[PDB]
Amino acid sequence: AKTVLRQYWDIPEGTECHRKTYATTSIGGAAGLVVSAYSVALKTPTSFLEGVARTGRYTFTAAAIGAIFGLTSCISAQVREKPDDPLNYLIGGCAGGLILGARTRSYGIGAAACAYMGLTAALVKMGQLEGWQVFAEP
Amino acid sequence: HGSPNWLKVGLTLGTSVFLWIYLIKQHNEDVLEYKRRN
Amino acid sequence: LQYGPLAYILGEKATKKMTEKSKLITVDGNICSGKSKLAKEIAEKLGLKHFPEAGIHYVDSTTGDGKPLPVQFSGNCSLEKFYDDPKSNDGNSYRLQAWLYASRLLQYADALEHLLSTGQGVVLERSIYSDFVFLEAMYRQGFIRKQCVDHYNQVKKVTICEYLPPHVVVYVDVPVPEVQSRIQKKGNPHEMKITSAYLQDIENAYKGTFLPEMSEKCEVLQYSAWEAQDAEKVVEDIEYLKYDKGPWLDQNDRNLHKLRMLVQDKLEVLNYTSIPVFLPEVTVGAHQSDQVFQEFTELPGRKYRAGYNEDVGDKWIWL
Amino acid sequence: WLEAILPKTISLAQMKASTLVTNQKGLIKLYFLSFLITILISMILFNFHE
Amino acid sequence: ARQWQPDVEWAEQYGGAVMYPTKETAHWKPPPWNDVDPPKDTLVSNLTLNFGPQ
Amino acid sequence: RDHWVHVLVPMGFVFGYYLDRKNDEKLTAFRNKSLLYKRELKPNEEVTW
Amino acid sequence: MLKYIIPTIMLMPLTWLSKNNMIWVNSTAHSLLISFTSLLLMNQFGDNSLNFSLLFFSDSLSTPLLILTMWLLPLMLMASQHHLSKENLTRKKLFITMLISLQLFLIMTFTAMELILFYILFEATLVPTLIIITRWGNQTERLNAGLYFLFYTLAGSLPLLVALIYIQNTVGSLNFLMLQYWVQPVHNSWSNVFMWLACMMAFMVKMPLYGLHLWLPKAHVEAPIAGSMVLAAVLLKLGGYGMLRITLILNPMTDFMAYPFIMLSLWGMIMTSSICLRQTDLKSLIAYSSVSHMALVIVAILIQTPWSYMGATALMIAHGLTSSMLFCLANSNYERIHSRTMILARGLQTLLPLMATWWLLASLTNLALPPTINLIGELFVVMSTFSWSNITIILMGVNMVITALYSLYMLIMTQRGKYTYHINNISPSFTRENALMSLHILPLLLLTLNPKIILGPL
Amino acid sequence: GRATFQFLPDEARSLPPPKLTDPRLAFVGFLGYCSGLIDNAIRRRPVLLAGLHRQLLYITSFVFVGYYLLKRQDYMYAVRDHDMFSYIKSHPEDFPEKDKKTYGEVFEEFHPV
Amino acid sequence: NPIIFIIILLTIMLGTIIVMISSHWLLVWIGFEMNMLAIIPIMMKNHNPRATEASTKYFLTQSTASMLLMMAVIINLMFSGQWTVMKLFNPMASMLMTMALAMKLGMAPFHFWVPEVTQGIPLSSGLILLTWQKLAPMSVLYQIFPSINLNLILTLSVLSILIGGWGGLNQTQLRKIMAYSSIAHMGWMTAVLPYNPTMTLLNLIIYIIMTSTMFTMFMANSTTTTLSLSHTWNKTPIMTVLILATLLSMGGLPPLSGFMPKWMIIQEMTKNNSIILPTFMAITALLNLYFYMRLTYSTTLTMFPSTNNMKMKWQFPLMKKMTFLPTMVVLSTMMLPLTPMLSV
Known part of the structure; x- marks a missing residue:
């Protein structure tokens, strides 16, 4: 609920890189599941009882990416300097291109994932950092 | 011997004769009301 | 025939015009x-x-006043052209069918209103049903190709829905082997040498094809002879009622069926055929081509630019 | 390489409108099982009960 | 035959289907041009009872 | 007739140029400024406003 | 003011209301007259600029720029006449109406009194232009020019209305430019970049940077008959001036990030003119001029420090004519020979002798001989942009070389012997060919006599 | 406001009213005056001036209605204000009187090029 | 037959007038319980093997849609035991209200329906009546308005105006293309709804007009996109300038009135200092426009006039009040800062 994400945040933003990443890496996978599970209501199947497990083979991910993103900052965090800078908490995004590339084929994703899932990382931090609100009232 | 209905033709004319009349009937009345009230 | 809801719920025609x-x-x-x-x-x-x-100008025989306009603006294969049976041509021998069909519905669409506005009996000539005899000698004589045969057959299943069939439907007195000379002796200069194929195959194809309605509900009547000719005229005059009166309607289909009270089946034949814009409203073309029945955009699509002149010639002002 | 990057947006989306129509065809059972995933998944997820 | 091209094949490419933008999977069908009547029609003959030596 | 179509339209100008004169009466609210800008004693400010 | 919109809307039923073929001469006659009104009350101050109404100061601003906008209208019907005479009058009545329907907003815009009348009228075109491109095209590639012309112009100009409604309720009221007399600056954050970036990038997508110009030759290569709206779309573009109303103020003090718009368009200026040399299609060849020495203003505007506005204004209306007129030549020479392929037309200059001096004076004003406006519009660019950093003399000094080989190669391609197979090309430029081609070089060079009427305030 | 489900209450007596020759009321029904001309053109009239009994009765309708509606609009923006000042007037604690001072006081940035 | 069709077609609005007029939770059940009772026969009229495999996929999808509600009425009969109509006093009520009420409107999920019904109802006549059922529910949400979990009614919104957008780009039948992009405009009006809930209705009326004037135009014979090609060279060209004077205005461009809801709505959704929400809505209705362009490249490009097709007859449909609407569906922008203070 607001819960998990909030918990992590009010946790080790720039430091205590372990719990945070272990969390951001497990939550990514958790989110990944949801979509895989959903794929059975709207999409059908044909490999019987065991089939759904087979299906999940394609979703054998999300978790990996989550882990990696946290890991990058986990490895960094206090690294060279404050990884709190707008450009930095970026870094967790791009490794993502590589992640998806590894997951499947090449040239037609791994850049875009590194690209766009790169672009949209920084904003988060940059967002609360200037005090932005998405859902508000007067 | 043009053949409209010659039934309704003139209603629209006659009706507007009412409306503008009734319009100003509310207007020429209400104009003084401002001053009568203020 | 009904006119809106307003001219109906007050008074109508169901059995009281019939x-x-x-x-x-x-x-x-x-x-x-x-x-x-x-x-x-x-x-x-x-x-x-x-x-x-039938004939190209029947739609010109409505709307006026009424002088028939030329063959460009009313397009077709121009009777006394295809009598060259152009199996190699521009074409087409199919596009004739369309306008030959496009009125073929319009007569039958203009009849079904005449009854409910009057109640007069109406004799026809070749109704929408019996036209298909040509296609047998039109398809087997090779001048029509494939894909133009099924097209108006894909039109057939669409176009015919609410139509009450004719009652006393009468196949013709037929000459054994004379229409060779009948087409010969009567003149008809461009009704000509076209051979057994479009001669003989239709006759084999009248009964064995038109049979279904002949065995359908409404009682049919049949002659094979020279003609009625003062002998069977009165026979088909009075005694064509005696068969059309007591033992007349089988499933009847034309009762103006179980909505006969002027309801969903009764007045919605006569509200469909007033302002006959919707009657040929599915006859308008398919996805793209058919390769035969076509008009390009400007080439030759300016034919509309000529017939375009104010499109309503007279309504003067003030009313 | 100016026309690869932006019109990539064209043939990016126009494909995702092939996964929102093709794969949804038919089987009134298959919708209805999926309203159920949605009506439970709103319980666990978020503020919805809070 | 100059000003432009509203040509042969521009109509059929919108021809009735799901109109695969970049890829085809399952088309439906040229929906019925009249009041829709694709499906099967059900007619049972009658019931066969013998009213017998009773 | 007399061709209303033609130059009768340019008369739209003075039609409009008058409208730009409709406002100056409601924009009068300052006759007072220090930039000369006077509206001091004269029968000049009095015209045009 | 209403002195203008009212007659020019009064034009609107001067046209259809008329008879048969009298229509063209009917409206071309009047449409010239309005030019007396154009100057009439205009070219007042000068100092302490003119504002005659609440929501209009027509143009005071020293961005007069409006007199041209009222020129190009009755230059169209002399321009557009050629092949538009071949379809119906009730359609020909349309094409004169929407074309006016454009001319009415360009008078509304450039005045606007404010920001928020600008925008809704800044986006208020694209209704009239898009309809002229898609219909009355030539090729069938036009249908894509319809989209690309949107989905950029509209694509990023929505972030305006997110930003300009963000200012309206933040500081006072934007209702008026003429009150900025309270403006606080913009220091820095990861929010304010976006603000500055949202209040900018919508304008760039019109006057192209070397990115995101991908539409500009797509629409011009294939575009209406005469350049009928192609003359107008060379007005529309330069009308991105409004960046002159903003970037002067309203976040003045971020120059911090200017550099990706400098070095990005400053190395394209030396660039896209050079990708214009091997072009095989003539209405392409001119379309890439229009980027080049237009995109020089974007390094004039961002830099502050006038002597740029001395030189940045003269440029918006510098090629405003020269770049207009070339699309008028390449039209005519296309009437007779129906390929736009540059090669095909050769061996002219014998057969149309009077039209010789027409090419020349056109292609000479990209060369920018010193006396005309062109250089006196470029040499106030180089004088300030030199002081920025001394090294700008090189690249923009190269621009002054490749552009000279650029222009000539277009003329000198039409000096050759070719008799070759053409039985066409008989018409020796009937007057309209040389009449509408004038009313450019006559008014253009002329201004150099008293060229204080084209200048900013600075 | 009050006297609910009233087009306009009795309190609108004190407003001017919005009498004619305003550009809108003229403009109102102009967009109808270009509407009437359509009304012919859809059916292939093909007059482009057809019976003046259809080519009028529009212009009659709009401006009447356009008028009879503008009488309340102007009202509404009055009751909006009315309810504002009378609140702005009381609670002066929520409405300070700013002081007077500028030059010789304020510093700006100060960042020239 | 013809009388009752005005008895039925009257009882609908009587079904939705008890909805807007009532104080009492029971009546807002009975109120839109008798639509799903009184709508159904309209679908039928020509008795075909779609309408009857349509209204049965509609029926049981508005049957539960209701029947959940009655479970989220009787929850807060426990707690507080006071019916009436006001915030729901308990979170399992509202979350079982709003996301089980999105079934009638259908929002971001709960639409595998709106295309399965609107397509292939044999009756295209209307099918304008599926603008009532947008108007019954909202006349709850305006009342309950200060209770929502607030993380939802946006989460069904922003997953909607997206999902209804992409839905159509792939479509040809133009009953669907209106079916789609009628989930879209349910994205703007319930995304606003917690902030200043009028300036919703504004988008609600401007919507009832524009989608209204489409259908009345789509009624002559028009059905499939490539039957709108055979339109201008056949029926009348004054029709084509119309269908181009709206379909463009409906996605909206500022000189028209279709730009009127957005232009006002964002005055509201910023000023509450949420500026990262509306762009993504503002920017997504963009590729909601590329239906209409490419719909509008059908009719003005003179595409292969049908075939030899000669319609010499005039028309006798009912255009009723079409000769008005696209002077109010277009030209109203210049008129009104009323809509925020008029209906309020």
């Missing part, structure tokens, strides 16, 4: 057989309005 004098009817005919010689002669006895058969 006294049993309604009795829609048609005839068939071969090539130069039953055209005008008999069916025309019958209007009275029983006071039945008659309709003309």
Whole structure:
């Protein structure tokens, strides 16, 4: 609920890189599941009882990416300097291109994932950092 | 011997004769009301 | 026929314009057989309005006033052209069918209103049903190709829905092997050498094809002879009622069916055929081509730019 | 390489409108099982009960 | 035959289907041009009872 | 007739140029400024406003 | 003011209301007249600029720029006449109406009194232009020019209305430019970049940077008959001036990030003119001029420090004519020979002798001989942009070389012997060919006599 | 406001009213005056001036209605204000009187090029 | 037959007038319980093997849609035991209200329906009546308005105006293309709804007009996109300038009135200092426009006039009040800062 994400945040933003990443890496996978599970209501199947497990083979991910993103900052965090800078908490995004590339084929994703899932990382931090609100009232 | 209905033709004319009349009937009345009230 | 909801719920016509004098009817005919010689002669006895058969200008024979406009603006293969049976041509011998069909519905669409506005019996010439005889000698004589045969057959399943069939439907008196000379002796300069194929194959194809309605609900009547010709005229005059009165309607189909009270089946034949813009509203073209029945955009699509002149010539002002 | 990057947006989306129509065809059972995933998944997820 | 091209094949490419933008999977069908009547029609003959030696 | 179509339209100008004169009466609210800008004693400010 | 919109809307039923073929001469006659009104009350101050109404100061601003906008209208019907005479009058009545329907907003815009009348009228075109491109095209590639012309112009100009409604309720009221007399600056954050970036990038997508110009030759290569709206779309573009109303103020003090718009368009200026040399299609060849020495203003505007506005204004209306007129030549020479392929037309200059001096004076004003406006519009660019950093003399000094080989190669391609197979090309430029081609070089060079009427305030 | 489900209450007596020759009321029904001309053109009239009994009765309708509606609009923006000042007037604690001072006081940035 | 069709077609609005007029939770059940009772026969009229495999996929999808509600009425009959109509006093009520009420409107999920019904109802006549059922529910949400979990009614919104957008780009039948992009405009009006809930209705009326004037135009014979090609060279060209004077205005461009809802709505959704929400809505209705362009490249490009097709007859449909609407569906922008203070 607001819960998990909030918990992590009010946790080790720039430091205590372990719990945070272990969390951001497990939550990514958790989110990944949801979509895989959903794929059975709207999409059908044909490999019987065991089939759904087979299906999940394609979703054998999300978790990996989550882990990696946290890991990058986990490895960094206090690294060279404050990884709190707008450009930095970026870094967790791009490794993502590589992640998806590894997951499947090449040239037609791994850049875009590194690209766009790169672009949209920084904003988060940059967002609360200037005090932005998405859902508000007067 | 043009053949409209010659039934309704003139209603629209006659009706507007009412409306503008009734319009100003509310207007020429209400104009003084401002001053009568203020 | 009903006019809106307003002219209906007050008063209507269901059985009170139909006294049993309604009795829609048609005839068939071969090539130069039953055209005008008999069916025309019958209007009275029983006071039945008659309709003309076919030909390119029938839609010009409505709307006016009324002088027929040329063959460009009303497009077709121009009767006395395809009598060259152009199996190699521009074409087409199919696009004739369309306008030959496009009126073929319009007569039958213009009849079904005449009854409910009057109750007069109506004799026809070749109704929408019996036209298909040409296609047998039109398809097997090779001048039509494939894909133009099924097209108006894909039109067939669409176009015919609410139509009450004709009652006393009469196939024609037929000459054994004479329409060779009948087409010969009567002149008809461009009705010509076209051979057994479009001669013989239709005759094999009249009964064995038109049979279903012949065995369908409404009782049919049949001659094979020279013609009625003062012998069977009165026979098909009075005694064509005796078969059309007591043992008349089988499943009847034309009762103006179980909505007969002027309801969902009764007045929605006569609200469909007023302002006959919706009657040929599915006849308008398919996805793209058919490769035969077509008009390009400007080339030759300016034919509309000429017939474009104010499109309503007279309504003067003030009213 | 100016026309690869932006019109990539064209043939990016126009494909995702092939996964929102093709794969949804038919089987009134298959919708209805999926309203159920949605009506439970709103319980666990978020503020919805809070 | 100059000003432009509203040519042969521009109509059929919108021809009735799901109109695969970049890829085809399952088309439906040229929906019925009249009041829709694709499906099967059900007619049972009658019931066969013998009213017998009773 | 007399061709209303033609130059009768340019009369739209003075039609409009008058409208730009409709406002100056409601924009009068300052006759007072220090930039000369006077509206001091004269029968000049009095015209045009 | 209403002195203008009212007659020019009064034009609107001067046209259809008329008879048969009298229509063209009917409206071309009047449409010239309005030019007396154009100057009439205009070219007042000068100092302490003119504002005659609440929501209009027509143009005071020293961005007069409006007199041209009222020129190009009755230059169209002399321009557009050629092949538009071949379809119906009730359609020909349309094409004169929407074309006016454009001319009415360009008078509304450039005045606007404010920001928020600008925008809704800044986006208020694209209704009239898009309809002229898609219909009355030539090729069938036009249908894509319809989209690309949107989905950029509209694509990023929505972030305006997110930003300009963000200012309206933040500081006072934007209702008026003429009150900025309270403006606080913009220091820095990861929010304010976006603000500055949202209040900018919508304008760039019109006057192209070397990115995101991908539409400009797509629409011009294939575009209406005469360049009928192609003359107008060379007005529309330069009308991105409004960046002159903003970037002067309203976040003045971020120059911090200017550099990706400098070095990005400053190395394209030396660039896209050079990708214009091997072009095989003539209405392409001119379309890439229009980027080049237009995109020089974007390094004039961002830099502050006038002597740029001395030189940045003269440029918006510098090629405003020269770049207009070339699309008028390449039209005519296309009437006779129906390929736009540059090669095909050769061996002219014998057969149309009077039209010789027409090419020349056109292609000479990209060369920018010193006396005309062109250089006196470029040499106030180089004088300030030199002081920025001394090294700008090189690249923009190269621009002054490749552009000279650029222009000539277009003329000198039409000096050759070719008799070759053409039985066409008989018409020796009937007057309209040389009449509408004038009313450019006559008014253009002329201004150099008293060229204080084209200048900013600075 | 009050006297609910009233087009306009009795309190609108004190407003001017919005009498004619305003550009809108003229403009109102102009967009109808270009509407009437359509009304012919859809059916292939093909007059482009057809019976003046259809080519009028529009212009009659709009401006009447356009008028009879503008009488309340102007009202509404009055009751909006009315309810504002009368709140702005009381609670002066929520409405300070700013002081007077500028030059010789304020510093700006100060960042020239 | 013809009388009752005005008895039925009257009882609908009587079904939705008890909805807007009532104080009492029971009546807002009975109120839109008798639509799903009184709608159904309209679908039928020509008795075909779609309408009857349509209204049965509609029926049981508005049957539960209701029947959940009655479970989220009787929850807060426990707690507080006071019916009436006001915030729901308990979170399992509202979350079982709003996301089980999105079934009638259908929002971001709960639409595998709106295309399965609107397509292939044999009756295209209307099918304008599926603008009532947008108007019954909202006349709850305006009342309950200060209770929502607030993380939802946006989460069904922003997953909607997206999912209804992409839905159509792939479509040809133009009953669907209106079916789609009628989930879209349910994205703007319930995304606003917690902030200043009028300036919703504004988008609600401007919507009832524009989608209204489409259908009345789509009624002559028009059905499939490539039957709108055979339009201008056949029926009348004054029709084509119309269908181009709206379909463009409906996605909206500022000189028209279709730009009127957005232009006002964002005055509201910023000023509450949420500026990262509306762009993504503002920017997504963009590729909601590329239906209409490419719909509008059908009719003005003179595409292969049908075939030899000669319609010499005039028309006798009912255009009723079409000769008005696209002077109010277009030209109203210049008129009104009323809509925020008029209906309020």
